[PDB]
Motif scaffolding. Sequence first.
Motif, short mmCIF file in Angstrom:
data_model
loop_
_atom_site.label_atom_id
_atom_site.label_comp_id
_atom_site.label_asym_id
_atom_site.label_seq_id
_atom_site.Cartn_x
_atom_site.Cartn_y
_atom_site.Cartn_z
N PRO A 178 1.75 -8.02 -24.39
CA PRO A 178 1.35 -7.67 -23.02
C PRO A 178 0.79 -6.26 -22.93
O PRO A 178 0.92 -5.46 -23.86
N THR A 179 0.16 -5.95 -21.80
CA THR A 179 -0.42 -4.63 -21.59
C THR A 179 -0.47 -4.29 -20.10
O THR A 179 -1.54 -4.21 -19.50
N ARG A 180 0.71 -4.11 -19.50
CA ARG A 180 0.80 -3.79 -18.08
C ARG A 180 2.03 -2.94 -17.79
O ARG A 180 2.99 -2.93 -18.56
N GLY A 181 1.99 -2.22 -16.67
CA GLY A 181 3.10 -1.36 -16.30
C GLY A 181 3.23 -1.21 -14.79
O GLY A 181 2.42 -1.74 -14.04
N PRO B 108 -1.07 0.94 -15.95
CA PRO B 108 -0.63 1.08 -17.34
C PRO B 108 0.48 2.11 -17.50
O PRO B 108 0.64 3.00 -16.67
N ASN B 109 1.27 1.96 -18.57
CA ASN B 109 2.39 2.86 -18.83
C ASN B 109 2.03 4.32 -18.53
O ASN B 109 2.84 5.07 -17.99
N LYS C 86 0.47 5.64 -16.26
CA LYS C 86 0.68 5.98 -14.85
C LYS C 86 2.15 6.24 -14.55
O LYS C 86 2.49 6.92 -13.58
N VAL C 87 3.03 5.68 -15.37
CA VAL C 87 4.47 5.88 -15.19
C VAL C 87 4.98 7.03 -16.07
O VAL C 87 5.39 8.07 -15.58
N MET C 88 4.94 6.81 -17.38
CA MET C 88 5.44 7.79 -18.35
C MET C 88 4.78 9.16 -18.16
O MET C 88 5.30 10.17 -18.62
N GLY C 89 3.63 9.19 -17.49
CA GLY C 89 2.93 10.45 -17.30
C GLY C 89 3.12 11.03 -15.91
O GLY C 89 3.92 11.95 -15.72
N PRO C 90 2.37 10.53 -14.91
CA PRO C 90 2.44 11.02 -13.54
C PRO C 90 3.55 10.35 -12.73
O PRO C 90 3.98 10.87 -11.71
N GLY C 91 3.99 9.18 -13.20
CA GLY C 91 5.03 8.46 -12.49
C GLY C 91 4.56 7.97 -11.13
O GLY C 91 3.87 8.69 -10.41
N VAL C 92 4.93 6.74 -10.79
CA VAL C 92 4.55 6.17 -9.50
C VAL C 92 5.65 6.35 -8.47
O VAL C 92 6.58 5.55 -8.39
N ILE D 232 2.46 -5.24 -9.66
CA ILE D 232 1.33 -5.10 -10.58
C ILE D 232 1.78 -5.20 -12.03
O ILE D 232 1.13 -5.84 -12.86
N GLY D 233 2.90 -4.55 -12.34
CA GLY D 233 3.42 -4.58 -13.70
C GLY D 233 4.88 -4.18 -13.77
O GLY D 233 5.67 -4.51 -12.89
N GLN D 234 5.24 -3.47 -14.84
CA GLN D 234 6.61 -3.02 -15.03
C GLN D 234 6.69 -1.97 -16.13
O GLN D 234 6.40 -2.26 -17.30
N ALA D 235 7.07 -0.76 -15.76
CA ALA D 235 7.19 0.33 -16.72
C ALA D 235 8.22 0.00 -17.80
O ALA D 235 9.37 0.41 -17.71
#
Length: 207
Positions: A34-37, A41-42, A44-50, A194-197
């Motif tokens: 898979p390729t979603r977060g 994408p990851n 957006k989470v691991m970096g700026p965080g949602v 949309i996805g899942q971190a």
Amino acid sequence: MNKLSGGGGRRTRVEGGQLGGEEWTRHGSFVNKPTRGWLHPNDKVMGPGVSYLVRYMGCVEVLQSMRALDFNTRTQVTREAISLVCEAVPGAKGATRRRKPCSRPLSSILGRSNLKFAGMPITLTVSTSSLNLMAADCKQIIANHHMQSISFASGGDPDTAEYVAYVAKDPVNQRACHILECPEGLAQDVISTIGQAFELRFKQYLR
């Protein structure tokens, strides 16, 4: 000849790579593909965080068994769980208000909702296997990153109507759920999912 007949070396040994299922195999298996977060994408989470503003609502407890409801128990549970948190803290119009008998969906599922600080606007930050909250109105920050498991439960449909329900059960000696309301904030992910971190180079703790 280190070409035709394989090649290289390094340690490997024999391992298991063929596990079907004890009885019938009809479950999901998402491992390396898979390729979603969360939201995006990851990165957006691991970096700026949602993170968005969300009214946190106590905790909806569920003591369901390993065989409740003649289907899945998704609706029944969350439905009575959220509607239950209202019976407790009806101040947040959602499923009830003032008072209501209520009880349980159908089976032994559902437990009890805690109304310690329900309906509290705050900034929830979602990160790859790490969710930190921040008291918006309280003028402080909430630290809660003990569990990081959010897959199947209430992505953004099976809950009630316009309420967000969450699930948290790391160990096998408690397992409880929480409720949240998205006032045009996290709603982006909690509504469509949309996805899942989920990445974690390693399992989780292994300690």
